[PDB]
Design a protein around this ligand. Structure first.
Ligand SMILES: Nc1nc2c(ncn2[C@@H]2O[C@H](COP(=O)(O)OP(=O)(O)OP(=O)(O)O)[C@@H](O)[C@H]2O)c(=O)[nH]1
Ligand SMILES: Nc1nc2c(ncn2[C@@H]2O[C@H](COP(=O)(O)OP(=O)(O)O)[C@@H](O)[C@H]2O)c(=O)[nH]1
Ligand SMILES: COc1ccc2c(c1)NC(=O)CN2c1nc(Cl)nc2ccc(F)cc12
Ligand SMILES: [Ca+2]
Ligand SMILES: [Mg+2]
Lengths: 68, 421, 440
């Protein structure tokens, strides 16, 4: 019985050293992925409105051509 | 190397841009040919920030000169250092802008923009690590105000991840008569609030008043004014151009100076127009502010102070601590340690000791309130709307630019009233 | 074996590595080209100094260190300075654009572009190790690299090296030498992200160091060079047990048994004496009992706080130089009666002492007096939580108006990371309350 216990304790220290490398590795990848989407989503929002600005400069120039 | 890219646009833009390079070229040891005849190597260590290195050891400003009338252009080469610039980097209209914003933004400026954008890219792609851009222009008339803000739009679209720093020159009825200026400025600011990270307000009303009262100039010229701007602009770039404690660049400035994206309009200051306490007193003195706004009427969100000269920085540390203690109610309490200072050993030409003061004060709403008022005096009348609706613009666009600038003042007030507890 | 790799991250971390590695060299007799006349074991050895220095076959002793910074200004000066020959190019790693004082850029935007290369270089240092003990990570709290790259590297080191030790030397921000108004944000973000991944962290309060410099060395406006040369003395003392042999010498790791009563309670208070100028140290020899006493004067601490108004969970004395146990024991006994030293009720009140005989060294042209004997006390006191309290308060003043918070959100971070970090800090401050309360 005592040796059964002795190997269960070393199996736990391994189990937990491992679960800890695991959850770190995963916590990282989750963060790095949510960060690319967020930063991109933000850069996309900036462009979508910088370009909606270009569409309004078409509409404005096409109005002065409805002057002549 | 961290390359800023300089862009002068319009009548006002190119002139204040010109004396800029004359001054910083002299500080750095560069004659109008582009060679270095200097004493100390502290003038070269970060020279690449504003200068292209050409073999034959020639330093070429990284400047893009732009206008809608070839007149302003010719003056530049003719003047001092005109031949230090890059001949290709001149980009010139012909038809001009005629103090109309629509002509700079939507129509005639549109026709020249892509010809500027091309010089931008050529200069940008030459950069190991592009900080971004600084645009010298005016918001009062024509090319600088409208094409300058259209160029801003286009550049941010190609470089959405670079810093956009402008030196905007605000109109003062004490310096120009053309009545459409309250229109031009307001339509520009509507763009500046949305597409720059840092705008130094150069106020022609405060430049005049300074020259008229302190400098006692009964009739100040656009050359006596621009003498003040060149002093300011050499100052608010000391930490970009010279080695220091802090590795200053256009983004570290923005991160630390701008607590809310829209509230990015800085009140500059200079002194003297001396001892380390007199400097500091004057530098925080509304008489030394290059924007007609009194700090004692609002609260400082954030402040930067450049001390230039040979002086005890222990003294400076106690002096700067002193002004925050004795003036504590004029710095927002919810942003700790929000007043930083830097000292550079080399002072500007002809001053043994200077100070330069960049502030982000809710009192800048004063500046914007004066423009807002002159605007509505015309817009309530519908005056000169034809110079604009004729070029294709909707009336809604004046309403919108107006509501936006009204919000910007409303937001400055929000944080002037904000408390910690 | 028991080799330690040091990692120096950002301006503070790098510049402090310059001070520490120039100091180690003077301590061990190593010259700026890496040769050591006293090492007769060429190309290798398991001498004590080899815990911090590998040896090339040509006789060069090479720091087991890596310098990482997101820009090249600061590390370019190592590459061209007095000790440029000491480091192999590949140990000195730089980017092109720094973090601009932004934790997000240090952790995600700019840092994600260099992390694999930094980890790789570290692996080449660990692969030269017969029994790697752990890492020593030097970094500011305040800078965007110091905070966000350190913590990215910490998460990574935990993945690639599991529970292998990671100690921190962390520069805690101070208004007199601060760079950025956002140092409180970077501070909390990195303290939260790192807390799980660090076994022991010695905080250095820039204001503590600045005051000691002004007051005991008579430097009017102390520089980073002034502060670094004092920090490296304290770092030297904490690592001297690793780098030196000695009968009465006690492994750092043995002090860690005592210093960390729970995983999160791992921030020991450092105190160092004598810090004394040459003129004031002339004709005035300071005895074992004088320097020991100085350790309990709060004005000699690395971090500003009142241990008097908190509780001790551990107190260690690391002596170097002319010191023998008889004196040490005498001095502790006087201090116990004449000073305010309350232990929590659940831990023994003995002092743990180590003595290294090699006397302290000073750096050419320094302001520190070369003394015959020195001491660094490492205490775990609840009082350190004050430093957390202050810093946590500056964070709050700003986050309630979300000032500057847009500079982080635009780089990809969410407000939720902010409240998550501040809550962790709120809990940490509550843990430090709980350990101090008596038992039932
Ligand atoms: N003791 C000491 N502290 C320093 C030194 N250099 C910088 N610091 C501190 O570091 C803090 C800012 O972090 P830095 O290390 O300078 O910035 P960084 O790590 O290079 O990260 P970036 O923002 O990307 O530049 C400031 O509060 C300084 O007090 C130094 O040489 N010695
Ligand atoms: N301070 C200053 N302001 C100027 C200068 N030149 C023009 N301005 C201002 O700019 C406005 C006119 O815009 P302008 O520069 O002529 O645009 P451009 O003709 O298209 O280049 C006027 O309100 C002037 O007050 C100058 O040299 N210094
Ligand atoms: C207190 O809040 C801050 C304000 C400004 C700054 C800063 C913190 N820290 C930084 O690293 C960039 N920086 C500065 N940037 C530039 Cl371009 N010029 C400067 C001139 C003087 C000066 F004190 C700071 C700067
Ligand atoms: Ca050996
Ligand atoms: Mg840096």
């Amino acid at each position: 019985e005592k040796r059964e216990h002795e190997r269960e304790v070393i199996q736990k220290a391994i189990e937990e050293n491992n679960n800890f490398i695991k959850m770190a590795k995963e916590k990282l990848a989750q963060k790095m992925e949510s960060n690319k989407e967020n930063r991109e989503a933000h850069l996309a929002a900036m462009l979508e409105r910088l370009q909606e600005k270009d569409k309004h400069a078409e509409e404005v120039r096409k109005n002065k051509e409805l002057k002549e | 190397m961290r390359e800023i890219v300089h862009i002068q646009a319009g009548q006002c833009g190119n002139q204040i841009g010109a004396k800029f390079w004359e001054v910083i070229s002299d500080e750095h040891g560069i004659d109008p040919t582009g060679s270095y005849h200097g004493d100390s190597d502290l003038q070269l260590e970060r020279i690449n920030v504003y200068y292209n290195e050409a073999t034959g050891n020639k330093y070429v400003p990284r400047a893009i000169l732009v206008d809608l009338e070839p007149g302003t252009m010719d003056s530049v080469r003719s003047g001092p250092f005109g031949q230090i610039f890059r001949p290709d980097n001149f980009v010139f209209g012909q038809s001009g802008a005629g103090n109309n914003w629509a002509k700079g933004h939507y129509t005639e400026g549109a026709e020249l923009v892509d010809s500027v954008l091309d010089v931008v890219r050529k200069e940008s792609e030459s950069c190991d690590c592009l900080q971004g851009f600084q645009l010298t222009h005016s918001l009062g008339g024509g090319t600088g105000s409208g094409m300058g803000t259209l160029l801003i739009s286009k550049i941010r679209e190609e470089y959405p991840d670079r810093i956009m720093n402008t030196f905007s020159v605000m109109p003062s009825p004490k310096v120009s008569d053309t009545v459409v200026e309250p229109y031009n400025a307001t339509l520009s600011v509507h763009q500046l609030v949305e597409n720059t990270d840092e705008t130094y307000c150069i106020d022609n009303e405060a430049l005049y008043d300074i020259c008229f009262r302190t400098l006692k100039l009964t009739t100040p010229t656009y050359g006596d004014l621009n003498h003040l701007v060149s002093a300011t602009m050499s100052g608010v770039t000391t930490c970009l151009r010279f080695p220091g404690q802090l590795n200053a660049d256009l983004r570290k400035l923005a991160v630390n100076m701008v607590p809310f994206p829209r509230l990015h309009f800085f009140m500059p200051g200079f002194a003297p127009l001396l001892t380390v306490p007199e400097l500091t007193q004057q530098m925080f003195d509304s008489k030394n502010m290059m924007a007609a706004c009194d700090p004692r009427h609002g609260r400082y969100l954030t402040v930067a102070a450049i001390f230039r000269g040979r002086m005890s920085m222990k003294e400076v540390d106690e002096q700067m601590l002193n002004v925050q203690n004795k003036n504590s109610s004029y710095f927002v309490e919810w942003i700790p340690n929000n007043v930083k200072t830097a000292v550079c050993d080399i002072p500007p030409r002809g001053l043994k000791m200077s100070a330069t003061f960049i502030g982000n004060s809710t009192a800048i709403q004063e500046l914007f309130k004066r423009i807002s008022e002159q605007f509505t005096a015309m817009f309530r009348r519908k005056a000169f709307l034809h110079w604009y609706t004729g070029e294709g613009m909707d009336e809604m666009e004046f309403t919108e630019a107006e509501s936006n600038m009204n919000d910007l003042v409303s937001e400055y007030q929000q944080y002037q009233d904000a408390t910690a507890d | 074996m028991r080799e330690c790799i040091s990692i120096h991250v950002g301006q503070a971390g790098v510049q402090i590595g310059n001070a520490c590695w120039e100091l180690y060299c003077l301590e061990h007799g190593i010259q700026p080209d890496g040769q050591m006349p006293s090492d007769k074991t060429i190309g290798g050895g398991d001498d004590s100094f080899n815990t911090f220095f590998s040896e090339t076959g040509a006789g060069k002793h090479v720091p087991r260190a890596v310098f990482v910074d997101l820009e090249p200004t600061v590390i370019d000066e190592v590459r061209t300075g007095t000790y440029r020959q000491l480091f192999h190019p590949e140990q000195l790693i730089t980017g092109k654009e720094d973090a601009a004082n932004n934790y997000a850029r240090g952790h995600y935007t700019i840092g994600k572009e260099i992390i694999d290369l930094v980890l790789d270089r570290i692996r080449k240092l660990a692969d030269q190790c017969t029994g790697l003990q752990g890492f020593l990570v030097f970094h500011s709290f305040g800078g965007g690299t110091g905070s966000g790259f350190t913590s990215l590297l910490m998460e990574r080191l935990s993945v690639d090296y599991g529970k292998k030790s990671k100690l921190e030397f962390s520069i805690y921000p101070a208004p007199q030498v601060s760079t950025a108004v956002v140092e409180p944000y970077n501070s909390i973000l990195t303290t939260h992200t790192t807390l799980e991944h660090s076994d022991c962290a010695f905080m250095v309060d820039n204001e503590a160091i600045y005051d000691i410099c002004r007051r005991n060395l008579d430097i009017e406006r102390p520089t980073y060079t002034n502060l670094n040369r004092l920090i490296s003395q304290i770092v030297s003392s904490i690592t001297a047990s690793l780098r030196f042999d000695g009968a009465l010498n006690v492994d750092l790791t043995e002090f860690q048994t005592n210093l960390v009563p729970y995983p999160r309670i791992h921030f020991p208070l450092a105190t160092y004496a004598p810090v004394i100028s040459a003129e004031k140290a002339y004709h005035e020899q300071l005895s074992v009992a004088e320097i020991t006493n100085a350790c309990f004067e709060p004005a000699n601490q690395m971090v500003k706080c009142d241990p008097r108004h908190g509780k001790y969970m551990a107190c260690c004395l690391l002596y170097r130089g002319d010191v023998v146990p008889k004196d040490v024991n005498a001095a502790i006994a006087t201090i116990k009666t004449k000073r305010s030293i309350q232990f929590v009720d659940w831990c023994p009140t003995g002092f743990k002492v180590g003595i290294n005989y090699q006397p302290p060294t000073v750096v050419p042209g320094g302001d520190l007096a070369k003394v015959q004997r020195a001491v660094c006390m490492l205490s775990n006191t609840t009082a350190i939580a004050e430093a957390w309290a202050r810093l946590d308060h500056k964070f709050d003043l700003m986050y309630a108006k979300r000032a500057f918070v847009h500079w982080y959100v635009g780089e990809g971070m969410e407000e939720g990371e902010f409240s998550e970090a501040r809550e962790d800090m709120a809990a940490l401050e509550k843990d430090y309350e709980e350990v101090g309360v008596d038992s039932v």
